[PDB]
């Protein structure tokens, strides 16, 4: 390997982790929970379990 | 056995189509011995052969 394309240092700034099972639009579970806020499934979970 | 004759005779006696003839699925042997229109008349009165009601075509939606 001698071309400049070879031996060129790779410095990642960002890695995509959105859902590939469709048109995902959130990177993490926590980011999705933060943006949307509480849902019905989260309300009734603590409605019974306090 | 086969009740092709009995359904046709009951269709004529009841003055309906073969659509509307109900032969008893349980008393098949009783009906299979009915070879004449008189026996069909007796089986109709006995309740083994029944005229089914007209399929509903309501005009309530149109009204």
């Amino acid at each position: 390997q001698t071309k400049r394309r070879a031996l060129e240092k790779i410095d990642l700034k960002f890695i995509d982790t959105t859902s590939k099972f469709g048109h995902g639009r959130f990177q993490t579970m926590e980011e999705k929970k933060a943006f949307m806020g509480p849902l019905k499934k989260d309300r009734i979970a603590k409605e019974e379990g306090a | 056995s086969m009740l092709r004759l009995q359904k046709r005779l009951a269709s004529s006696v009841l003055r309906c189509g073969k659509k509307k003839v109900w032969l008893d699925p349980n008393e098949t042997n009783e009906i299979a011995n009915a070879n004449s229109r008189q026996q069909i008349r007796k089986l109709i009165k006995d309740g083994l052969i029944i005229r089914k009601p007209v399929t509903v075509h309501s005009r309530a939606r149109c009204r």
């Binding site: - | 008893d24 009783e30 007796k42 006995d46 309740g47 083994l48 029944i50 089914k52 009601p53 509903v56």
Partner: protein, 31 residues
């Protein structure tokens, strides 16, 4: 006279179809 079990088996013979089908008015055997 009709008891609870006689009425229960009566329900089988009088229903000769699904919902919307007519009920079986009688079933009499005579010779």
């Amino acid at each position: 006279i009709m008891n609870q079990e006689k009425l229960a088996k009566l329900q089988a013979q009088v229903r000769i179809g699904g919902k919307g089908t007519a009920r079986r008015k009688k079933k009499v055997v005579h010779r």
